[PDB]
Structure 1
Amino acid sequence: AKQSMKAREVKRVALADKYFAKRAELKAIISDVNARWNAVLKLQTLPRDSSPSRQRNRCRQTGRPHGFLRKFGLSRIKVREAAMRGEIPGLKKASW
């Protein structure tokens, strides 16, 4: 799904941990009853995609930003395809 829409998301995971989680928890406590000196939040001028939830969640194989699943990291279309060829450990067509 469009190299660049892919590229975008890699840029976002990249930034997502160059700063955020790290530089960005300078906010976690920085905003919590330590009151005040407003310079606190303001700081938020960082890359933008630096933020984690600027990340979509794409079928690791195809890029599909829809019909995704966390267990397998794939779209229902590429999942079924791998499922039927064994390929996905433990997984079979269940009934009950």
Structure 2
Amino acid sequence: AKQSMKAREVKRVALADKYFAKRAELKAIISDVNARWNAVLKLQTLPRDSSPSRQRNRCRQTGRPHGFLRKFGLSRIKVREAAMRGEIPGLKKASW
């Protein structure tokens, strides 16, 4: 299969999906530094395997750090082998 082995980035930017959309407006004081939270803001050091800063273009097919788009998560270089699938809005090969 190999899908699970190369799914390192799948579980890195998934938990926090809705952890700030409805919290930033209400907790803007905590979210925004009132300067310096040298201790509270450094708590991200403890998780060394999943964090917002660890985003690496999730690709379960090959696990490489390339090939992602937050808008739809569609191919940008694999299009060469999947140009007929119709998954190329906005970004397409530049020959025309």
**Larger helix proportion of the pair:** 1
- Does structure 2 conserve the Cα–Cα contact (< 8 Å) formed by 1:12 and 1:55? yes
Percent same amino acid at aligned positions? 100
> Matched residues in 1 for 2:54 and 2:25: separation?
16
Cα deviation digits, residues 27-70 of structure 1 (max 9, x gap) = 97447564688654354455344421212104464444335566
Q: What are structure 2's unaligned runs of at least 5 residues?
A: none
- Larger Rg: 1 or 2? 1
Q: TM-score, normalized by length of structure 1?
A: 0.44
**Larger strand proportion of the pair:** 1
Q: What are structure 1's unaligned runs of at least 5 residues?
A: none
Q: TM-score, normalized by length of structure 2?
A: 0.44
Which structure ranks higher in relative contact order (CA pairs < 8 Å, sequence separation ≥ 6)?
2
Q: Report the RMSD for the aligned CA atoms in angstroms.
A: 5.0
Aligned residues between the structures: 96
